[PDB]
Design an enzyme around this catalytic site. Structure first.
Site, PDB file in Angstrom:
ATOM      1  N   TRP A  37       0.833  -1.176   0.000  1.00 51.94           N
ATOM      2  CA  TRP A  37       0.000   0.000   0.000  1.00 51.94           C
ATOM      3  C   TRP A  37       0.874   1.233   0.000  1.00 51.94           C
ATOM      4  O   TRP A  37       2.042   1.183   0.394  1.00 51.94           O
ATOM      5  CB  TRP A  37      -1.036  -0.009   1.134  1.00 51.94           C
ATOM      6  CG  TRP A  37      -0.543  -0.040   2.559  1.00 51.94           C
ATOM      7  CD1 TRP A  37      -0.327   1.044   3.353  1.00 51.94           C
ATOM      8  CD2 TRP A  37      -0.280  -1.197   3.396  1.00 51.94           C
ATOM      9  NE1 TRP A  37       0.062   0.650   4.607  1.00 51.94           N
ATOM     10  CE2 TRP A  37       0.105  -0.713   4.661  1.00 51.94           C
ATOM     11  CE3 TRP A  37      -0.321  -2.585   3.202  1.00 51.94           C
ATOM     12  CZ2 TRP A  37       0.436  -1.543   5.721  1.00 51.94           C
ATOM     13  CZ3 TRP A  37       0.024  -3.431   4.301  1.00 51.94           C
ATOM     14  CH2 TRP A  37       0.399  -2.890   5.530  1.00 51.94           C
ATOM     15  N   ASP A  57       5.606  -4.784   3.407  1.00 58.76           N
ATOM     16  CA  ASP A  57       5.705  -5.619   4.566  1.00 58.76           C
ATOM     17  C   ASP A  57       6.929  -6.503   4.454  1.00 58.76           C
ATOM     18  O   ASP A  57       7.476  -6.722   3.360  1.00 58.76           O
ATOM     19  CB  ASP A  57       4.461  -6.491   4.716  1.00 58.76           C
ATOM     20  CG  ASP A  57       3.238  -5.702   5.136  1.00 58.76           C
ATOM     21  OD1 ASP A  57       3.387  -4.605   5.730  1.00 58.76           O
ATOM     22  OD2 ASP A  57       2.070  -6.137   4.966  1.00 58.76           O
TER      23      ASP A  57
END
Lengths: 109, 358, 122, 359
Positions: free
Chosen positions: A39, A58
């Protein structure tokens, strides 16, 4: 201060700050794998007064770090704007999708 | 003299049961569903759901469905995304249904894991990260359809007035309706007119769902409606949740599963907080507002107890709220809700609670 | 009398690490986990083996042999954790020892909860 | 413009590293090892260890060994007990070694998962619930021997003076010594005379381990020893940790990995608490006592900080203690220990901490 949820770059982090997890804002902790997808957030830098695009990759393939959990939501939007959304696991396409921690990577203005 | 036995069923009747989906985010590979009796707060049992489980109860009340991800060695080895079917009374595993390895891994919004109203199909959200909706035929025990038409859309809103129809919210600000055939494949589809401005007035995905219409609230406290009494969905809005006084303290909605509808009365329940601004859309409730969706006016406001998610039972006139760890039980038979009890420590990290269907 | 059957007693008394028969319990009381003192929560399986020991009953002044079985095959219950150690001994007295998983020989060894089963007078 | 990278190594030198085995008992299927820098309390990384992991570091300091249990579907499906070999600096998985499905599932006492002095064999405790000791050949990546001669015994105490020998504590109150051949099969074994009365004066299993002898403390505050300098094990004891004033206040030992030995001085460290009685043997430390094992006198007592487990570093003269969640670092270069720092929130439920090997 990079370990603080209020740090300017971390404005759309949902997860554990990798800098508290044996990594840095731009390096995964040892033995965790960066996500190729992320994101993206837009965060205001109060030091230089400029707005920056931040990519929230991540780090994946190890169980939850557990440290410095953040839930910041500046400019975050629901899943119908999918790459602005942070209530999903951006490890979802990794070889192993177990979520370890989140990074805040500076893309540019 | 005494002998320890197993094989037992849940002690309390189905009508007393609620399901608290504990993500256990700190140890997300050991998520689970905690089963509670809402009448007295008693812990009744649990179902393990491995990494970031999602859960729902079959519409007929007989089974619990979970959705989860396994790997051969947890943090390495082959991935298996599955739906599992569990017995609701015995809390035992019965069947595994294989999914393609792209089931949504994400927080427990209701709309990520649903069923058609007839209970014949499980309808779930996929993200690879390209989005599609997955169809699982319950009777067959198989995945039967990738709904690729839903690319760029998000979440599943079943239509309670049709057997095998549901809607999803799309990136154009409209809704896509999918009508399944009896084989679980897409029979027909339609796309509404634009309901909301994605850029200027984004809605929360959580519906306040009536029999034939759904209401949605926005980041800025507006309300939008999708009416599916007919084959084509008619959209409307905005109307504002806010009066002039409300606007002065910058009241806006916030939460996750943040709205509900009491269908008999048309009352919509919404979590709200003051001092709204960019980035507060997931803030805990300062208050719960009760809105008459017919008159478009607020009829009650009560303290929110930091709640983030809720759910409504129509028949018993109840609302549950959840702040992440504690569940509050409210009587909503009158416009002003009355707090009945709080169940402390129902979860470590839950954003979803649901009633057993009655 | 009532002190000998927890089914007849106040839940708050039984669901306590101080309850007399819970005197060498390591783990979560099954009676807090959707079961009772002598029934596993739904979907968990009794251990065929256990650690054992004696507990003094202050109500009738007698000592009783207790068998400390686990319920198995579901993840940790997490409620009413106890760590009592009366007459507990290390692994070289293996069946008196409670720092091991008495689910160890079950079909699925995942530890769910534990309890205290009354065998009889010591 | 930045780029996220992986493939990094632990950022602190090996000599700074400690390993906190977090059972995560509330969610025991997600146990893990937390790696910390003891000098500043920095979190360095972790190794996931599934259900009830155990951990040790290879004697050469190059690898981390874990032991754990998997099932195909966690709470159902086929069981796989394994040892895993991980790279110590990259904290990455390298190799799985298959075990029979009877590795010990239990709290993290040091003696359940050990290695021979020469580092060639991993030596682990089994329970089916019948007990045996398993031998893993590190080089070959194979389980090579099942020591059923150890039935009725518990825990592994490597003999630092011999390359591939260890002892275990038996239900007769004596020690069984096992000497392995070059292939890891048992070459010889011996049983000591009775060291302690199992019924009247049970010992804690945790050794205070010297190069050629081990000391043990008892439930009632006595000390026993096993001397393995000569060819057969000679046993002695008890002597009491307690003076008259200690006895009047009912001081006894309590904890899990509750003792340690500073070999150069012969000082033994023990967690103690007052008002001892039946059932208090795992109570947190009110105090740490420091005993001179030669003069058999206490030379210091200091607050225990509710510690349960400890470990010693010989070269740097350090003791770590651990209360379940927090790690305290002590300078033990002098008889009275000095508290250097506390590492808060090192674990949720750990009863074991270990130094990276340096010698």
């Amino acid at each position: 201060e990079v370990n603080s949820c209020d740090y300017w770059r971390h404005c759309a982090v949902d997860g554990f700050l990798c800098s508290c997890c044996g990594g840095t804002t731009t390096t995964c902790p040892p033995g965790s794998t960066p996500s190729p997808i992320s994101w993206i957030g837009t965060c205001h830098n109060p030091h230089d007064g400029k707005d920056y695009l931040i990519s929230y990759h991540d780090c994946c393939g190890k169980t939850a770090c557990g440290r410095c959990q953040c839930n910041t939501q500046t400019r975050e939007r629901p899943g119908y704007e999918f790459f602005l959304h942070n209530d999903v696991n951006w490890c979802m396409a990794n070889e192993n999708s177990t979520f370890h921690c989140t990074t805040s990577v500076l893309v540019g203005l | 003299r005494e002998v320890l036995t197993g094989g037992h069923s849940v002690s309390a009747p189905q009508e007393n049961r609620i399901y608290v989906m504990d993500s256990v985010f700190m140890h997300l590979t050991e998520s689970r569903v905690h089963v509670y009796d809402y009448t007295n707060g008693k812990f009744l049992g649990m179902v393990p759901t491995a990494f970031n489980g999602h859960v729902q109860v079959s519409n007929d009340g007989k089974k619990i469905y979970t959705m989860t991800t396994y790997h051969e060695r947890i943090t390495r080895g082959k991935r298996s995304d599955v739906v599992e079917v569990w017995d609701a009374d015995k809390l035992t595993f019965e069947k595994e249904i294989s999914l393609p390895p792209k089931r949504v891994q994400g927080l427990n919004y209701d709309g990520l894991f649903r069923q058609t109203t007839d209970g014949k199909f499980i309808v779930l959200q996929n993200a690879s990260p390209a989005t599609s909706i997955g169809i699982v035929d319950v009777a067959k025990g198989d995945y039967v359809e990738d709904v690729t038409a839903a690319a760029g859309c998000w979440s599943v809103i079943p239509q309670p007035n049709r057997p095998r129809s549901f809607m999803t919210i799309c990136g154009d600000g409209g809704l896509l309706t999918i009508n399944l055939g009896e084989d679980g494949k897409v029979a027909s589809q339609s796309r509404s007119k634009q309901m909301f401005s994605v850029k200027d007035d984004p809605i929360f995905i959580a519906p306040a769902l009536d029999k034939d219409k759904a209401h949605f609230v926005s980041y800025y406290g507006n309300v939008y409606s999708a009416d599916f009494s007919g084959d084509e969905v008619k959209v409307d809005g905005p109307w504002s949740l806010l009066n002039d006084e409300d606007k002065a303290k910058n009241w806006v909605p916030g939460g996750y599963n943040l709205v509900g509808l009491h269908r008999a009365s048309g009352r919509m329940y919404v979590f709200m907080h003051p001092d709204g601004k960019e980035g507060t859309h997931k803030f805990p409730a300062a208050e719960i507002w009760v809105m008459d969706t017919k008159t478009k006016q607020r009829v009650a406001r009560i303290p929110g107890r930091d709640a983030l998610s809720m759910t409504i039972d129509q028949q018993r006139n109840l609302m549950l709220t959840l702040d992440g760890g504690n569940v509050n039980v409210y009587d909503i038979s009158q416009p002003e809700p009355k707090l009945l009890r709080t169940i402390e420590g129902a979860a470590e990290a839950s954003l979803q609670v649901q009633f057993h269907p009655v």
